[PDB]
């Protein structure tokens, strides 16, 4: 089934129908006019951030460091040799000027945590980046700025069909490749129900705490996530 889209729902409707029961939703009309939505071209990113060092996940997975200018040159603009992803990086703490182009969603105030503790991560990469199926320990608003992403969501109630890795370090990550699952080794995966969507610019996906999610970029993409409680 498809994740529902709601236009600027009230705080109470979001709380009662999505936050408390832990149900995903896409919020429309919330982030669509944030400055980032019109301002964040590649050229703007290069002007404001190009000389700064960022962590880049390549691939055989490795983590390296390079400037934003290098990342753009090697993994976005020139016919790249491998997939590189500027993933899960607190770019807005590093570059406070960019924080002026985003806002904390008002719905985060329904949480029990402090705004000071909300973690804001950038996710910037070419078409074809993949975040394998995993779950996070806080609520998440994933705001799509540039490009589209295909997202698959499985409830925590389906965890037994997703074959989490046994190591404590990877217990929040599935052993299954969502889009080409090995059903001989992971047969229960096939019948596990899920939601999916294509998340487009200006839209926010609410990923409830511990909801399993898998993400593939369909175009050159930039997302901003807000981890909150
Ligand atoms: Mn995640």
Numbering used by the authors: 182 to 240, 247 to 416
Could you pull the original sentences from the published paper?
We were unable to obtain a JMJD5 structure complexed with the hydroxylated product, but did obtain a JMJD5.Mn.succinate (decarboxylation product) complex structure; this structure manifests substantial conformational changes relative to the 2OG/NOG complexes (with/without substrate) including in DSBH residues, such as the Fe(II) binding residue D323. In the succinate complex, part of the β3–β4 loop (aa 241–248) is disordered, whereas in the apo-JMJD5 structure the β3–β4 loop, together with βIV–βV loop, encloses the active site entirely. The combined structural analyses identify mobile regions involved in substrate binding/product release during JMJD5 catalysis, i.e., the β3–β4 loop, N-terminal to DSBH (aa 234–254), and the DSBH βIV–βV loop (aa 342–381).
